[PDB]
Design a binder for these strands. Structure first.
Lengths: 787, 787
DNA sequence: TTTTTTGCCCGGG
DNA sequence: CTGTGAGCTTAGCGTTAGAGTAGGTTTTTTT
């Protein structure tokens, strides 16, 4: 029965599973795969805890369908991190049968067009983008299957409502062609009260189970007392350690199980709070070792390899990590460089680290199981802790093979107790659409996009079809205004020129501003703020410097950071007129910055909303300029107050926004603006090729400078030590694009001073000085390397 | 001796000469080829009257050397019309031997890279341009021969001094290398004085003849009395058909030779005076036949075919050609189209036209003999006629031995008789080099080109090698201020950033602006303006429309027309609000336009020297904007005060200026601005697409408005007659680049009106109405073709 | 109160 | 928005910011 070898897998995949793990399925998996019609081809929704073999029940369906029918699966995952991990995992299983597995995730994408793949594993908005493009190609018939994780995100508005739109399009196009399942939807979720509604919407079969291989003792600590689920008072605890201001004994709650050689995962409200607790915990591991209780075992021979591997990173070994990592204490949050996450994840996954204070980043996207989970408060960011967040936090408790029973302890004040009791006793709110109009309110951005994305694809081009599409949404299940809201959208789309009216009844056609908003996969709420920037550049584009191209290209964010408007006003005042003119043409204005330094965010009329959206995008441009200007990432974080983890997210985004907005300007037909961006797409790439890595040892070589030496002479630093200073000076003078020292007639001097100060090679040296000093540096580097 | 077959020509060329020419040389041709060292590879400078077989000597020397030395030869010719004719001759002559003959002239380029050619037939600046690039590619060793026509041109300031700069380079690059010739030079110089000096400068043989196949009977008329050049009276004239319509009775002097039934040619100081006087003469041939020496034999059947060929002209038959051409009278201007000029010449070349009136456009650039030449006055323009122009006029008398003698008649009133006679009794002034200076004067721009070009090409870079170059000039040869002239050049080229000074004498290197000058082959004095326009565009470029890029690629002229400043000032206010913004950024201003309306004469400081060039260029940009906007030339002429010759020169020059300024911008490193210009150069062309030609012809559709139909549905006229009006309406809506109809916030209402106007057609049709009308015209005219 | 003339790399079948 | 303990700093008791997350066509290969 449960032994997987009986299920008829091809031996290569069976042997790969035998290598990867258990040969026998859990009983719930055998039931769920033996519902009456899921194997026939009917859609499915199911739920199991994250500790269960959740994805196996999809993988065996994928393996069957892609082998039994020569059609292409589309595996939709909530985050790039889990998408990358699942890509490599699934590649390892199927590759010996010849299934081509590749993914759309972050900046990475398949080296071949979708028609060559067999299983595309991708993030949600990559999948919706691919669905839009499959519609534009009308090649949708290729799509065999959609596998959806976290289907309970149907109601999440920041991201997730895309899952309504995406599944609705597949239903509608199937129903449009209908009026043996063409596209099977397999939807994985946490258990919901109305899960059978989602299953009924998807016409799906249903399974859900409480089964988990490792059981969880949930609890709330209040005072000394620990209450089990159903508030059974199982235990009282007394402080094994006495610590100044550890009024909750949070260190002792760690130490108690550290005495048992078991690890602790400690979720906190914020990054600052994680650093403070990783500091405090490491100080007590130090004190216990210094005042030398049971002994503490560390295997520091391994921690020195981890901590040296951190020292190699251009971040440097962070001042907190210097203190904590030697003791097996770490911290983990999205302020860390991706490599620092992967190092600290790996060190905790092997258990070299024993305590890891973390934000929600270890709740979603990072599967670090632990014996004991702790949640430092019921309040997060002044919210009550979300019930979905809590039940995803505690799902980390228990380690499959290393441990027998999982433990979790919420820490709660006596006055807060009702909130903790609610978190344990409560259950997830019923999932409900974002399409639903609130009774008296303006129609929602999810509905506006949901209507635009069919019209622009040439699907449901007449309004009677739009009512037929609305009847496919999950909203049309949640209600059992449904007609009147649709014609309130087309008014908004018409009066913003996303679509055109045509008589005969009527037919609606996409404008270029339609096709651009669709095929760049921007949101309609963004392409107004982008178009008001792109079109205003057509009226006067500064070509002598990058800042205006960066303002068009820089990612849209709201509150990318807390912004110091006063330092931004001090910064804007300092800009060169070469660049301050770009601020004027963009519309940055002293009358607006003066308000934003003097007072609150302006009340948002459409004018004041636009003028606010301009400045936050400009501030993000000045950061993004400094990144390409090779200003030290240590300096940038002083200058703008962001931190190194945000910068890598900005680098990841700006490299993509250059690509989107090129397609946006292409679809508008503004080909003369496209080329000015399609060239800049070559320069938003921040990692050097190995060509310069030797030359980059020379302190006077910016990569922009090493670029011309290697292009001119293939130089090894030995060659730069051999080179004649006169040849370097001429190579330097033939490196920079020509910019006069001459003042032209009716110029202001500041506009040419900034042409002169832009040619000195650091302010900085003149080339006659630099070309001597760089040969003297190179010959010193050479003799230091040869010894 | 003189029988050509004895000279050892290859039979293919010999038979081609037997076909095209005659089997014998003239006496002077043999005597010159028998100059002992010439056939050994000595340089030669020779003269023969232009009606003799001047070029046969040069052609025979090329043919021999390319067979024997087997090195590539460069044939330099004064004008593109002369170059094209001599290209087809040399190609048709040599190609049966397999000599790869092609050339560089006008917008033309050879079908393969230079090294593929055996002969390059070339205009002066395509040759001096080529010589610069052979030095950059260091292929100078390839150049085995240079052959030069009109070597007397060295004294022109506007042009042709390049023929000193080129030959001085070849001399210097020989003598510096050497201290059987490295290059053989053959120069033709039309019987100058000081011709021994030119021969001595090139270290060449001197050869001269006055031989003519038919003698020139010069004469001069005052009153009724005609005098020989010796001022003997030859005749008193009898003005048959006496009329007050010509107070000098030149109509009778034309009719006289017309009674001899031979062609006559008349040179006139002005287009309108030419155009008037052709009408006057034609109405007397009308008067003869309407009254009826015999009447003029008209052969009207051929003239009606010629006149129908003018009716077939895209610009239609000129009403003045309706008057004159049926009588065998025509006129000839730079103001005609080039097609009309070629047609009218050909009709005269076949002798169908028997009288032709011209400006100097028949002095130089073409050779069409006429038995009698008439010169209307000793005064041409505001000044006495140049004796060089007189000789090239009267040289037209020899009808290729189809007639036994040639005639010339200078005509004047009783005043200035001596200054008239001085054209007959005078001879060419001494040739000289415009590299010469006054003491109270700047070093001339032709010297600045010389001493710049050596530096930038990477030759003679040392401060003493330039004085070694100057010793090879024809200036220095003529002198056997000049020592300071080279130092004045280097100071001027430093202050204009064309060169860089490096220490340890000193060694000078090109800037990018140096190499950009030479690579574009612009003048230094032009490049100060073409750069300042580009440098100003970098500070704020209007991508919104075509006008601001046209201002950069607008051909730069002095007085390409008189500018009717009041009509231009009216045409300035009529510019749309976006185009009136371009006028701000380039610096067009009412405070200058109104001042040119107020008064023609202005003083000029450096500000005013730029301001004139800005406006004179901008006015020419407006003409280009209309020409790409498909405005009818019938309007443009009347709108700007322009004619169909000036327009045609501006089209043919603009296609080259967008070429040069790509290569100018590319090598300044402004690769963003380069790609805009390189993109726009793909639009700045005026040919007709093969497949669209009939579609644009029949339906009266603008080229892009038809092209998108062929792109969107491949319609022929027979298919557009079937097109659905709603489908065409949707195409008409989405064919254009997106211009939003909505006003933005923070925008002038007078600005958005433009963007909504741009989508209208012309009148002022809606897209609905145009999409109806276009289908009606297609389906109606389909029937008119089928009937 | 007014004459004629020239420059550039690159693609095509 | 909501909240609270962290933050500022000389001292020893003043004053508040605060989670994580993502979209593009061409292109893959070197001096």
């Amino acid at each position: 029965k449960l032994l997987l070898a009986n299920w008829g897998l091809p031996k290569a995949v069976l042997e790969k599973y035998h290598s990867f793990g258990v040969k026998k399925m859990f009983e719930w998996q055998a039931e769920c795969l033996l519902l009456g019609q899921v194997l026939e081809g009917k859609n499915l929704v199911y739920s199991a805890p994250t500790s269960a073999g959740k994805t196996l029940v999809a993988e065996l369906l994928i393996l069957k369908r892609v082998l039994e029918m020569r059609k292409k699966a589309l595996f939709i995952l909530p985050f790039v991190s889990v998408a990358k991990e699942k890509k490599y995992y699934l590649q390892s299983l199927f590759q010996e049968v010849g299934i081509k597995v590749d993914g759309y995730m972050g900046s990475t994408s398949p080296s071949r067009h979708f028609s060559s793949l067999d299983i595309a594993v991708c993030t949600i908005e990559r999948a919706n983008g691919l669905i839009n493009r499959l519609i534009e190609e009308n090649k949708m018939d290729l799509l065999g299957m959609v596998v959806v994780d976290e289907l309970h995100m149907l109601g999440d508005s920041h991201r997730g409502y895309l899952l309504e739109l995406l599944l609705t399009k597949i239903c509608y196009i199937t129903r449009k062609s209908a009026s043996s399942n063409a596209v099977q939807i397999v939807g994985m979720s946490a258990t919901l009260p109305n899960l059978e509604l989602v299953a009924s919407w998807l016409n799906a079969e249903l399974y859900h189970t409480d089964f988990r291989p490792v059981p969880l003792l949930e609890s709330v600590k209040v005072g000394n007392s620990i209450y089990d689920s159903s508030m059974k008072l199982v235990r009282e605890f007394e402080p094994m350690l006495q610590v100044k201001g550890d009024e909750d004994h949070v260190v002792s709650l760690c130490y108690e199980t550290i005495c048992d050689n078991h690890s602790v995962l400690l979720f906190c409200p914020s990054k600052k709070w994680c650093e403070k607790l990783a500091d405090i915990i490491a100080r007590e591991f130090y004190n216990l070792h210094h005042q030398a209780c049971p002994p503490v075992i560390l295997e520091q021979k391994e921690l020195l390899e981890v901590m040296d591997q951190l020292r190699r990173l251009p971040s440097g070994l962070d001042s907190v990590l210097q203190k904590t990592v030697p003791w097996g204490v770490a911290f983990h949050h999205a302020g860390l460089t991706f490599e620092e996450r992967d190092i600290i994840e790996g060190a905790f996954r092997q258990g070299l680290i024993r305590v890891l204070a973390a934000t929600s980043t270890l709740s979603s996207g990072v599967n670090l199981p632990a014996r004991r989970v702790i949640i430092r408060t019921p309040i997060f960011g002044g919210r009550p802790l979300d019930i979905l967040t809590y039940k995803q936090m505690v799902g980390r408790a228990g380690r499959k093979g290393v441990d027998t029973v999982g433990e979790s302890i919420l820490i709660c004040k006596n006055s807060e107790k009702s909130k903790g009791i609610a978190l344990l006793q409560g259950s997830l709110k019923p999932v409900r659409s974002c399409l639903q109009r609130r009774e008296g309110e303006e129609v929602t951005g999810s509905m506006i996009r949901a209507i635009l994305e069919i019209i622009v694809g040439g699907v449901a081009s007449t309004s009677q079809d739009m009512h037929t599409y609305a009847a496919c949404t999950f909203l049309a299940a949640s209600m059992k205004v449904q007609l009147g809201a649709i014609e309130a959208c087309v008014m908004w789309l018409l009066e913003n020129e996303f679509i055109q009216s045509t008589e005969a009844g009527k037919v609606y056609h996409p404008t270029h501003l339609g096709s651009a908003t669709l095929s760049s996969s921007l949101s309609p709420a963004d392409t107004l703020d982008i178009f008001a920037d792109l079109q205003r550049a057509m009226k006067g584009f500064v070509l002598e410097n990058d800042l205006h191209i960066l303002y068009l290209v820089t990612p849209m964010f709201e509150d990318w950071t807390t912004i110091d408007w006063y330092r931004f006003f001090c910064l804007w005042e300092k800009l060169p007129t070469s660049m301050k003119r770009v601020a004027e043409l963009v519309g940055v204005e002293e009358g607006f910055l003066a308000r934003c330094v003097k007072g609150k965010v302006v009340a948002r009329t459409e004018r004041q909303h636009r003028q606010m959206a301009i400045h936050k995008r400009f501030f993000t441009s000045l950061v993004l300029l400094d990144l390409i200007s090779e200003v030290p990432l240590r300096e940038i974080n002083q200058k703008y107050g962001c931190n190194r983890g945000q910068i890598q997210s900005l680098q990841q985004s700006a490299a993509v926004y250059a690509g989107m907005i090129t397609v946006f300007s292409n679809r508008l037909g503004w080909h003369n603006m496209e080329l000015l961006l399609s060239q800049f797409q070559k320069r938003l790439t921040f990692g050097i090729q190995r060509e310069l890595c030797d030359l980059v040892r020379v302190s006077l070589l910016n990569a922009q400078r090493a670029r011309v030496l290697y292009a001119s002479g293939f130089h090894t630093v030995a060659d730069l030590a051999r080179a004649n200073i006169v040849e370097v000076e001429v190579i330097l003078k033939n490196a920079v694009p020509f910019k006069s020292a001459r003042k032209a007639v009716d110029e202001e001097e500041e506009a040419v001073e900034e042409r002169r100060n832009m040619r000195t090679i650091w302010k900085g040296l003149t080339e006659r000085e630099a070309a001597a000093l760089i040969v003297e540096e190179a010959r010193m580097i050479l003799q230091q390397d040869l010894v």
